[PDB]
Design a protein around this nucleic acid. Sequence first.
RNA 1: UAUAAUGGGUCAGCGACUUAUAUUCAGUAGCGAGGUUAACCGUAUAGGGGAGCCGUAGAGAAAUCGAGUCUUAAUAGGGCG
RNA 2: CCCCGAAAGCUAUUUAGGUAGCGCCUCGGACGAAUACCAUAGGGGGUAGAGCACUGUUUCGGCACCGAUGCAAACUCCGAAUACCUAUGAGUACUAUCCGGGAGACAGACUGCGGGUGCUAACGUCCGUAGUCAAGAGGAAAACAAUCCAGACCGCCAGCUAAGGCCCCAAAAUCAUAGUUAAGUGGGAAACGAUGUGGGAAGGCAUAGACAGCUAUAGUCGAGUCGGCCUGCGCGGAAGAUGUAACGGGGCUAAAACUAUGUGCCGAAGCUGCGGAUGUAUACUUUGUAUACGUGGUAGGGGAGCGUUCUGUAAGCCGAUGAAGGUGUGU
RNA 3: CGGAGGAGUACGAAGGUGCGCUCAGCGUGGUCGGAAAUCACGCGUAGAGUAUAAAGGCAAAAGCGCGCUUAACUGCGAGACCCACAAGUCGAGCAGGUACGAAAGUAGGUCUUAGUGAUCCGGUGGUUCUGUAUGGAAGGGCCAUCGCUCAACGGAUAAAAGGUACUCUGGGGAUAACAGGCUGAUACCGCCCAAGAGUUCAUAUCGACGGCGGUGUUUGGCACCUCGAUGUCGGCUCAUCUC
RNA 4: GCUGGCGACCAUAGCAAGAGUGAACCACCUGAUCCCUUCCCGAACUCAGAAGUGAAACCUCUUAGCGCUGAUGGUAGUGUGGGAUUACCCAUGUGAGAGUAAGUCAUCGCCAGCU
Lengths: 57, 76
Amino acid sequence: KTIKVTQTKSSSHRLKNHKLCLQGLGLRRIGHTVEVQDTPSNRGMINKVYYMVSVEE
Amino acid sequence: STKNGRDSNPKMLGVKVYGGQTVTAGNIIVRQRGTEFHAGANVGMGRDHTLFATADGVVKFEVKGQFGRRYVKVET
RNA sequence: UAUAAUGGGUCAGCGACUUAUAUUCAGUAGCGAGGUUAACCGUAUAGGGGAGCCGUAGAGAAAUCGAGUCUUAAUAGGGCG
RNA sequence: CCCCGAAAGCUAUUUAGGUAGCGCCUCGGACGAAUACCAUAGGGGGUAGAGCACUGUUUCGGCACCGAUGCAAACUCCGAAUACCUAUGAGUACUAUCCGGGAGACAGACUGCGGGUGCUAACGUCCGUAGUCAAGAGGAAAACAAUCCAGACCGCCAGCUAAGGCCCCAAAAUCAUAGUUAAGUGGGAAACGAUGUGGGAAGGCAUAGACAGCUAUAGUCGAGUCGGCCUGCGCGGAAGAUGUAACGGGGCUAAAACUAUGUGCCGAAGCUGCGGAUGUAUACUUUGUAUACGUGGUAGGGGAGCGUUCUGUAAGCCGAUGAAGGUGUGU
RNA sequence: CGGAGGAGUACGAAGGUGCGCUCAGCGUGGUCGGAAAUCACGCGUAGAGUAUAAAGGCAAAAGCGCGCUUAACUGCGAGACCCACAAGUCGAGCAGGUACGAAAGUAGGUCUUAGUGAUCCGGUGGUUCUGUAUGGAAGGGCCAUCGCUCAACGGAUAAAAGGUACUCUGGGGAUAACAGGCUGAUACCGCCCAAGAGUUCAUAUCGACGGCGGUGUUUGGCACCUCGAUGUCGGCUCAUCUC
RNA sequence: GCUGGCGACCAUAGCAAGAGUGAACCACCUGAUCCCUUCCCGAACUCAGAAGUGAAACCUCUUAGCGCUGAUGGUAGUGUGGGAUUACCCAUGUGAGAGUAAGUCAUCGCCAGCU
């Protein structure tokens, strides 16, 4: 019901909406790991920035 | 020397209120040079083919009639 | 801009956002529906001096009205309050 | 000393290197979810592509029409992905909006994508869109604003990684398993030329005897041979001026080259560990205390301080048992 | 200083309303009359028209006729579009007076988007505004309207052309001439294919129509360095490198 | 089960060809006296009427003839990340136009007459 997301790359040069997706998931730096609800709304943000996050499903 | 180099000022035409939005009486819905959209129920037409709402409600687009004309209407 | 763009041979001393008046905003103090004197007088930072200024009511080009007023034939509608 | 932090755009200008209003920055006040990211639902389009139903244009047949066949920024019977508008909703985040004080700026640059112009030239010029520089240090690309990785509060002779790398200069594999190359290709360049070598799909002839050579199709011999197609890596084409000078160098050939796979390690001011400082917010219901999030910066905006001369406090306090000033040392 | 075209008007009907009607093309016949005047009948079909350029439109036709008329009205106006400002655009509805229809109704110019000029200064009509002692008046105000190729069209004045090699100051490598740089259209050099020429025979030697590269000696393109100075066309003296 | 009117819908519903319908309705149909009418015409509009015909017209039925609708699969394009620069390739999501198989001679609502 909850999943774990870890940021693996820098977000400094990314697109604005990608940075906002990271901020809306709650990730703040490289190596940061958060635990979020498994809902389609969160899954959309994860899937948009798939290339710089790691998911422990 | 070229004989070209002229153009006119922009006119800002197009759809102003899309399907599903709520309007009040007097709101302009479409700005258009010709009659690309036609006036349905509770919608009036100005002297320059502008379409406006004459009552409160929700905007709705459709295709109707024997000529396949595009209509916009307001549902109360 | 390492630039082969400008300026400086070196040291010591001097060298550039001020002053007066008016106005607006922000702090702070006194008094508070009120606040405050100017010139001047005064053995004088005191005490007198209320003329004047700001606030307390708007509308209208104006005469005029006034919590309303202007436009209008309209008590309708509308604009400023 | 601390906090925040732009722009090189639009409109107008006897205007074009000036200025003004708006856009972008900062400070104060009001007011809190009205904001954004994502999901779901509703909606219009005429671009990419495509097509010939219109407008033009094109080739070959038959008789302007009929059958085939192409093309288009100013053609459309069609037609996306994305973008854009609205409504509802979970989670995350000092978001949005309004009123005032102060500005700066209105010479931009490169790179990728979509284009006009130019020669599908230019580190050329003019637009749209994103990133970096401007105003940004660190590691890699030999050196190299604008590329790749990454956003520097201070200290440490601690640890893990990113891009990029592991024979020596110079930190880490002369690591492991299969192949290719002989050109120092790797480590500059085309049309075209060639039995250089590796792989693949087919075909023709052939031990009643195939190819080559030789004797005048027969004949001596004793297994393969013949000509194409696709594909990997190589060869020629390849001439310049101070000095090898077109791997950074040394050097490198079952590589220290190329292809594929795997196991370790090195590697930044990124992350983690330990110590210290500071801004804002929430709770302790003074506290100076804990927790959370922050602390790269030009033009600018805001906050807090150090020293110097003079006036009062000061007919006070220090001073010939030595003031100011000068010159060392310690803290 | 990219590729193409238009405007600086017109209309008292070419406006309003009620009623009514459909274009263009081709084919048959029918005097002059035919390629194509008018008449009649068919076929398929929006290719006609819309004052004018193009685009978006046009069957309740927005295209085309007839009768009656002036809504090409006055006071406004909820609400929107566009927007630095100044400006610009659309508009249901309400009151009064009209026009056309039997009536429900339609009409605040024309299918729409161009046909335009702020402020100042003056002119004309109206006015229950003001009127420098008082009553008037002059002058001013308010409402309506007139005088701009102010076209460099947000309009510096009511009113304005040239020379300087006799020159001067403040600035710029924001911007040209020389040399450097990037590029290589052009220039020069090399290669591929080969109609042909060469008594025959493409390749001894030349080689048409076309194609692909190299160099950085030409004529050019750009404007990156230098305008608080990089100061030269040729000659002389002295050279050094490439093939 | 037929006929008429008014709508929904706007080709899978349309065109074309062929065949039927007169009891009622509709259609042609008679003439032009009054109402009314033609830039001329009782051709259209209009009035007063049923002697004729379902010829034409309108409706209904049949046909895939023309037209219209139309998959599945593949191809083109394309957002995000990466690799390359004649404009492609990989991962992931999305996905035409044309053409092919196939389909279609519509389907509903309110009222009034005739059996």
